Design a protein around this ligand. Structure first.
Ligand SMILES: CC(C)CCC[C@@H](C)[C@H]1CC[C@H]2[C@@H]3CC=C4C[C@@H](O)CC[C@]4(C)[C@H]3CC[C@]12C
Lengths: 588, 579
């Protein structure tokens, strides 16, 4: 099985400079290739070229051959594994769980018993079967270690059994031992009929005699590619021996990078680069590469199928994975469930701290106190719902995005899972809040009064959280979305509800943009639940409560059935918008 | 090879080589036992293990480390025992991650510091000589007149920021200049040429110390003295070009085509993943240390092979440097200008009292309360946000001691008023005109001034919360609690007379209530109001009668007064830890 990966040519440009030039490479099964390069080498870009994770953002006129056969742009994700240099794992799941849910998202055939065989399988090869069933958690002494995180991520990519594995700087944030351990782990994986191609920054001296092929890019041009033996010979024949106690990586890297501190040394070192690069293109090792790749094209010895193997479970089965994947992340997390359920009760206890009872006397605050409580609720109910999203969703976002490119699921399938498990807590949370201070405030004690009130504020509590998803889908920094959403709810209740500006006498646009606030219909509901059955005692204008319901939101008593259906219809609107907003995120 | 050019000295240290020696230091969380004597003219680089109580070593020697205490051992600086005075007087510390102001130039950043570091007895020409002399020695004669923008992105490069960061210590001609990770993030070519710029600094009769993790191969050839460690126990100290010989002769010699530094750093490593792994090589580290101190126990060195600027002048220097930076930051101005404008029109147009029907009474009360109660929403977040951007700067400036909490306290409160006054005008005047408010210049100004004081009072509040709580999300939560409290007890959303005793006194000191009660007294003071009715029983009905308008200004100034007392005590006693 001469299983091989090649690049007949490779080029890539943005718009309008270019980033890669005639990158021609050839790696066999069992070889671990190392790609060095200075900043702006595009070595990070070349890995993305093979895994096909660029798509069509620029122009690629290269050819990627696998098993003597050319690949279409649509079959690059269909063969290659690719892991990022900073692995994002949900912190409230164990390693078995993380691998279990990963295993669940990758295969469509059944038998859950043999899934525990494969989840257990990949934990043996990577020395994590020791720490399976253990919580991942935080850093070294208070969770799982750095290298173990790297191996959990390598396990998640091994569950799909890719035949080519591209690693981006896997030894960046690692110790002298763990980064060496990962290089050791990577060189074992390749010798097991697998292709491992990785890039390294500060390659320590020991790593040199361990890689099967080392190649250097400088501004997209391939300077060298060969074995460490072939390399030492080449630059010696070019006229640059390795100094006595110098790391050949530290030496040839400096030798083939472009110093830019001065106009004179940029012209100088580039003149030196052009001699080394051009002398390489005329090398025996360089033409040994191009002679090999098309030797692979016309040898009909081992043609093959793309790997990873395209078995895809449906959407309804995948959401169920992510639904219990995220819910177990939230409930196993003790802090967040408490905060998610109680911050409405804290909001309500703070108001009740300031105003004990309502007092039914017009002169001691019969309506002044009533208008305030409903404004604070319609105003701060969407805010607390938003705090849920800007605090707990950005981490689940980074998980979704890593796994969305890898083909576990599409980004929108993440928020729908998220959309659904916040439903029980939010419904319970506003009942924690209503049941406590409604009766204590003493608003209006009929049981039906309380029932509507609870539901009426569940919608802004869901609306404010769902709006924060659709924004976080296209705004990255959650500190901004926190600033945005809070501005919109302060704008929403200040305009939409007739409280602080009578909805009838305000200028035309504020009437217009009123009909689009979810606050308008919420208040029209809540202004009825209290002021309908009341009568006052005592300047003293209003005597019975139906009069104030007339002064603002007139006729709203007739529209009570419709005003609930409207208010609650925004919830399915945001979820649908988010789905489309996250398919736009798919391309940014 | 890299680069060759001028290597002449321009700025040297005019004193005798002051010495630093340490005899048997034991520190823990750390370091077990070290001994050496260094002199000016030398440059000692430490190699050691990765973050193994040695990036804390230059903090233990300066006496300013944390997570432990010096447990035994003596530290001598110029033959004198270590003390924070000798550390402030001798050792110029270059912090790896420090901030400079982004919209100043290399001359300006050095000059503002030079007017606070050189003695008062220096003329401006002498101080200008020292700035230019530092620039020329650090090869910054090129690019001296450019902005040192970091988030302003475009400007000087990372090697030049570092060069400017060292100059901020070279300005007062130190004898002992210690650097922590000078080659962090730097280019191979840049890291090499920066080490030479330090080699010339030690040649300028200075004692230059370097903590440095995994050196590249070219940089190891540029060390003079070198200290190789494994954790808290030292392995070898001496001339760099003989580290191969010392170690070839003691039985773990150094292979070909391998950086000795990253070869021997791994040679004494102690791993932690197993009880027997960590058992074995701490036995190797303590054993290997046990045999170098006697190979140089009989050999000495353990070497193998003026009145200052006052409070006023610093106020003058800080208030300039602050105001000089923030008025070149045109992007944040235009945005903070529009966030006032676009808002002052959102309020004005909802209550537009002209081309329609006149403002209702309760419509006029909501407007006045909102104008005051809506301003902290923007004011709190950014006043807090500006402080936390400066704590990286504020901490090392107040620690090294080039100014006291005194001057900065007055510099911090006044450098924002030039900005503050524009922000209020853009926010205050448009809302007054759009909504049909009580006409005349006299009402208009009193309206403007109370809002100016309330927002100023709020600045002093949010400014004080930022220096008093450890982190942003706690300071943000604390000022939002005050704001939420001052909003409820503001006196519009709830009745003042129906206040629980503590919300009753919360209202007494809420500057959001005095804004509402004041502006309600400016509009409805003496005018008769059109349904007419005189404004007075109107305000008496809403308990806005007592506390005449002028008291409302005194009270609000008193509220900002108390906050100032909070803020000065906060700065002087609560240290301002970054991040
Ligand atoms: C789909 C709905 C529920 C989202 C929330 C309501 C949206 C559509 C409404 C409610 C309040 C409105 C904002 C209120 C005030 C202004 C001031 C104006 O100078 C710019 C537009 C802006 C910022 C409005 C934009 C539209 C707006 C955000």
């Amino acid at each position: 099985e001469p299983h091989s990966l090649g690049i007949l040519h490779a080029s890539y440009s943005v718009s309008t400079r270019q980033i890669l030039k005639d990158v021609s490479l050839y790696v066999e099964s069992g070889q671990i290739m190392c790609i060095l390069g200075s900043s702006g080498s595009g070595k990070t870009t070349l890995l993305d070229a093979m895994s096909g994770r660029l798509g069509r953002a620029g122009t690629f006129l290269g050819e990627v051959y696998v098993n003597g056969r050319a690949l279409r742009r649509e079959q690059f994700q269909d063969c290659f594994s690719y892991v990022l240099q900073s692995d994002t794992l949900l912190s409230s799941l164990t390693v078995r769980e993380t691998l279990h849910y990963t295993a669940l998202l990758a295969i469509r055939r059944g038998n859950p018993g043999s899934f525990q065989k494969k989840v257990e399988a990949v934990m043996a090869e990577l020395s994590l079967s020791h720490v399976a069933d253990r919580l991942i958690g935080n850093y070294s002494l208070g969770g799982i270690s750095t290298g173990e995180r790297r191996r959990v991520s390598i396990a998640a990519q091994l569950l799909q059994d890719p035949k080519v594995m591209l690693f981006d700087e896997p030894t960046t944030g690692l110790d002298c031992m763990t980064a060496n351990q990962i290089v050791v782990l990577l060189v074992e994986l390749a010798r097991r009929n697998r292709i491992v191609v990785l890039t390294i920054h500060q390659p320590r001296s020991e790593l040199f005699q361990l890689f099967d092929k080392i190649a250097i890019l400088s501004f997209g041009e391939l300077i060298f590619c060969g074995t460490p033996a072939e390399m030492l010979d080449f630059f010696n024949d070019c006229g640059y021996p390795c100094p006595e106690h110098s790391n050949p990586f530290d030496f040839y890297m400096d030798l083939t990078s472009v110093d830019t501190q001065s106009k004179e040394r940029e012209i100088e070192t580039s003149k030196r680069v052009q001699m080394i690069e051009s002398a390489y293109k005329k090398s025996a090792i360089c033409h040994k590469t191009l002679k090999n790749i098309e030797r692979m094209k016309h040898l009909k010895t081992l043609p093959m199928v793309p790997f990873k193997t395209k078995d895809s479970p449906g959407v309804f089965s995948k959401l169920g994975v992510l639904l219990r994947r995220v819910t177990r992340n939230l409930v196993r997390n003790k802090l967040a469930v408490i905060t998610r359920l109680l911050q409405n009760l804290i909001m309500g206890l703070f108001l009740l701290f300031f105003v004990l009872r309502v007092r039914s006397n017009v002169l001691k605050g019969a309506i002044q106190d009533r208008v305030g409580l409903l404004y604070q609720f319609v105003g701060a109910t969407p805010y607390t719902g938003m705090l849920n999203a800007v605090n707990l969703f950005p981490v689940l976002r980074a998980v979704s995005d890593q796994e969305s490119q890898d083909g576990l699921y599409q980004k929108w399938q993440m928020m729908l899972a998220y959309a659904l498990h916040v439903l029980p807590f939010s419904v319970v949370a506003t009942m924690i809040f209503s049941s406590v201070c409604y009766w204590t405030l003493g608003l209006h004690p009929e049981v039906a009064r309380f029932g509507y009130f609870s539901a009426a504020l569940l919608a802004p509590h869901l609306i404010g959280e769902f709006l924060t998803l659709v924004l976080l889908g296209i705004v990255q920094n959650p500190n901004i979305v926190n600033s945005v959403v809070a501005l919109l709810s302060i704008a929403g209740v200040l305009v939409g509800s007739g409280f602080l500006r009578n909805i009838q006498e305000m200028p035309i646009p504020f009437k217009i943009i009123s009909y689009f606030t979810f606050q308008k219909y919420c208040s029209e509901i809540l202004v009825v639940n209290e002021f309908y059955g009341l009568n006052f005692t005592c300047m003293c204008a209003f005597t019975q409560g139906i009069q104030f319901i007339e002064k603002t939101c007139p006729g709203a008593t007739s529209r009570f059935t419709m005003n609930f259906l409207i208010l609650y219809s925004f919830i399915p609107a945001l979820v649908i918008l988010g789905i489309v907003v996250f398919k736009i995120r798919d391309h940014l | 090879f890299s680069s060759e050019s001028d290597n002449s000295l321009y700025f040297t240290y005019s004193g005798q080589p002051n010495t630093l020696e340490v005899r048997d230091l034991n520190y823990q969380v750390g370091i077990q036992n070290l001994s050496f004597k260094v002199r000016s003219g030398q440059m000692l680089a430490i190699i050691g293990s990765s973050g193994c109580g040695r990036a804390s070593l230059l903090d233990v020697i300066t006496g300013r480390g944390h997570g432990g205490k010096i447990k035994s051992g003596q530290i001598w600086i110029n033959g004198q025992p270590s003390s924070p005075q000798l550390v402030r007087k001798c050792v110029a510390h270059v912090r790896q991650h420090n901030q400079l102001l982004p919209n100043l130039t290399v001359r300006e950043t050095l000059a503002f510091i030079a007017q606070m570091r050189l003695p008062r007895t220096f003329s401006q020409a002498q101080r200008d000589k020292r700035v230019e002399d530092v620039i020329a020695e650090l090869r910054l004669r090129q690019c001296a007149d450019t902005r040192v923008g970091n988030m302003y992105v475009r400007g000087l490069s990372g090697g030049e920021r570092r060069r400017v960061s060292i100059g901020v210590q070279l300005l007062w001609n130190p004898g002992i200049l210690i650097l922590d990770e000078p080659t962090s993030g730097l280019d191979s070519f840049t890291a090499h040429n920066l080490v030479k710029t330090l080699s010339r600094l030690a040649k300028g009769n200075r004692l230059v110390l370097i903590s440095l993790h995994q050196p590249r191969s070219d940089i190891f050839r540029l060390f003079d003295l070198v200290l190789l460690m494994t954790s808290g126990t030292p392995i070898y100290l001496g001339a760099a070009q003989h580290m191969v010989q010392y170690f070839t002769a003691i039985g773990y010699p150094c292979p070909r085509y391998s950086n000795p530094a990253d070869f021997y750093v791994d040679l004494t490593s102690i791993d932690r993943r197993s009880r027997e792994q960590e058992l074995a090589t701490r036995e190797k580290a303590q054993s290997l240390a046990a045999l170098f101190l006697e190979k140089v126990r009989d050999l000495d060195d353990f070497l193998w092979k003026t009145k200052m600027p006052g409070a006023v002048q610093q106020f003058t220097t800080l208030i300039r440097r602050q105001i000089s930076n923030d008025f070149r930051d045109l992007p944040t101005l235009l945005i903070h200008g529009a966030e006032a404008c676009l808002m002052s029109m959102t309020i004005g147009f909802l209550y537009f009292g002209h081309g329609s029907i006149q403002l209702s009474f309760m419509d006029t009360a909501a407007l006045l309360f909102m104008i005051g109660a809506l301003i902290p929403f923007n004011v709190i977040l950014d006043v807090i946000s500006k402080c936390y951007s400066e704590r990286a700067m504020l901490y090392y400036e107040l620690e090294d001691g080039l100014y006291t909490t005194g001057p900065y306290f007055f510099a911090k409160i006044l450098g924002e008023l030039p900005e503050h006054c524009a922000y209020i005008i853009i926010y205050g005047m448009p809302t007054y005109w759009l909504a049909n408010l009580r006409p005349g210049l006299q009402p208009f100004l009193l309206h403007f001034l109370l809002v100016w004081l309330v927002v100023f009072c709020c600045r002093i509040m949010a400014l004080a919360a930022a220096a008093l709580l450890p982190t942003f999300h706690m300071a943000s939560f604390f000022s939002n609690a005050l704001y939420n409290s001052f909003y409820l007890a503001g006196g519009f959303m709830i009745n003042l007379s129906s206040l629980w005793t503590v919300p009753a006194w919360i209202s007494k000191v809420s500057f959001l209530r005095w804004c509402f009660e004041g502006l309600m007294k400016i509009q409805f003071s003496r005018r008769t109001y059109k349904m007419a009715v005189s404004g007075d029983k109107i305000l008496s009905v809403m308990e806005l009668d007592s506390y005449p308008l002028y008291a409302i200004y005194l009270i609000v100034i008193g509220l900002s007064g108390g906050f100032m007392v909070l803020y000065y005590v906060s700065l002087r006693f609560i240290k301002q830890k970054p991040s």
